[model samples]
Target: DYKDDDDKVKLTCYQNGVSFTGGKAISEAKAASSQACQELCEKDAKCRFFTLASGKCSLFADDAALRPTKSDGAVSGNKRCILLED
Candidate 1:
């Protein structure tokens, strides 16, 4: 089950076949694991979308529009601090 905190939104985990390429990659970095990416998004106030793929994490701030797609070797999620689903 998914849950939400004051500033963090918990979502289902996609192992390695999900991605959010529709949003812009505002920031990116190399990560040891997917959890690192999730943490980065949670800490960043501007991050609304995040994707971890190929040992790298990409954070997006596209709160206005975000689209998720199925992709190999990637995991993605959206934040709920603001309205993400339209």
Candidate 2:
């Protein structure tokens, strides 16, 4: 069984139909789904935030901001929480 969270860094997520803008993409990938994008973001060492648009995953750095952006189907999740049983 997987634990709840790792109690490492805290994640601050944002948006469902909207995403962030104006941040540089440190890394990117053609993710098949949001889950795939999420995994890429979490695995990145310097992923401060991530934006997913039309299966395109873009990972931002630690100095990223929350500038909102609207697209056909955009999603942005900031930071990643490590695993823990909470």
Candidate 3:
């Protein structure tokens, strides 16, 4: 699911509570790693999910309670894409 042409990927975001509601604010445009992206989410209360890809992160959230969207954006399937942060 990670190594495919699909517009989705299963990535490691956090230990719990993760969602990816499109149109949500991307506080940090393509940061670096999902770990750091989670940190970014920790700073913001509206953060639901931190998208990390190609060594970048994109935070997403909205007024609606964030819920895990059905996608390969989480490291829960045949996906294996995670950004390593120091």
Candidate 4:
């Protein structure tokens, strides 16, 4: 995260998705993999389900995660979270 007009980030929480227990990174658009990038969507309050558009996690929430992209094809969702309970 950052502030307007500064060359520094205030905070950062970086994780290697592949090494994470329940996290995954998206490296390509319109491509499928065994890694469930969708899990990050339902589990995190900041993310509403995403589409791999041009190769990035297009996260969507009212209090969003920065870098918002306009999408006619984005898979829309509400407060609803999708995941396995167990």
Candidate 5:
């Protein structure tokens, strides 16, 4: 469940033990928590996705060409907005 405000979207889709690391990494950051990583991603206009592992955060751009991997203790998500009207 996420909040929606008509045209603009500010929803984040996150997953545990999941990582997207098949595309070019936009940036890397040292964050204490996954929330920080997500915020970092949200801060970056180009950061479409991010991965947090071992207190390390990696921001990436939008790329569906790559896939997801099961990374233990890793928290990752995509900042890409998905529109769903139901």
Candidate 6:
């Protein structure tokens, strides 16, 4: 259900047993809802990834060093555009 091209990135969702780590959350806020948290991330130029949990919204800077790790109750994904589709 997701599509992308060289000029645009897509936001995908992960569920329990999926998470990312290493990079720090550059922005944090108490969000009333998950949508509110996503909006906060969308407003930040440096936010390439985000996590919304327990009313907390966290934005992480995009970096090559970020790695995915397994964690329950956490959702994470990278915002990236495809250079080529093959």
Question: How many clashes in each structure?
Answer: 0, 6, 10, 0, 0, 0
Q: Can you write out model 6's per-residue Cα lDDT over 14-44, one digit (the tens) per residue?
A: 2333445565778866764445666778888
Candidate 4's residue-wise lDDT over 1-86, tens digit each?
56565575322122222211122322222423212445555466665434433234433444333332444223322334444688
Residue 2, candidate 3: alpha-carbon lDDT: 68
lDDT of 2 by residue, 1-86 (tens): 35656456434454566655676678887874566776777788877667777667777886546465667678666665455667
Q: Residues 9-86, candidate 3, lDDT per residue (tens digit)?
A: 444534322334444454754554467676666788766645554444556664344345644443211112355777
Candidate 1: worst-modelled 10 consecutive residues by lDDT: 1-10
> Which residue pairs collide, candidate 1?
none
Q: Candidate 3 has which clashing residue pairs, if any? A: 9-72, 9-73, 10-72, 10-74, 10-75, 11-73, 11-74, 11-75, 30-57, 31-57
- lDDT per residue, candidate 5, 1-86, as tens digits? 35554468444466677655666787878885677887777778888677776667878776655455657667776664456766
Which regions in candidate 2 have their CA more than 4 angstroms from the true location?
1-14, 63-69, 80-86
TM-score of every prediction relative to native = 0.55, 0.59, 0.41, 0.28, 0.61, 0.51
TM-score of 2: 0.59
**Which pairs clash inside model 6?**
none
TM-score of 3: 0.41
**Against the correct fold, how does model 1 do in TM-score?**
0.55
Judged by lDDT, which candidate is best?
A: 5
TM-score of 5: 0.61
Q: What local lDDT does model 6 show for residue 57?
A: 56
Which scores greater on TM-score, model 1 or model 6? 1
TM-score (C-alpha) between model 4 and the true structure: 0.28
- In model 4, the runs with Cα more than 4 Å from the true position are 1-35, 63-86
Total residue pair clashes for candidate 5: 0
| TM-score preference between candidates 1 and 3, better one | 1
For model 1, how does the per-residue alpha-carbon lDDT over 1-86 read when each residue is reduced to its tens digit? 34544466454543565655555678876884668887777788877667787667878877545455656577665554345477
lDDT of 6: 0.59
lDDT at 9 for candidate 1? 43
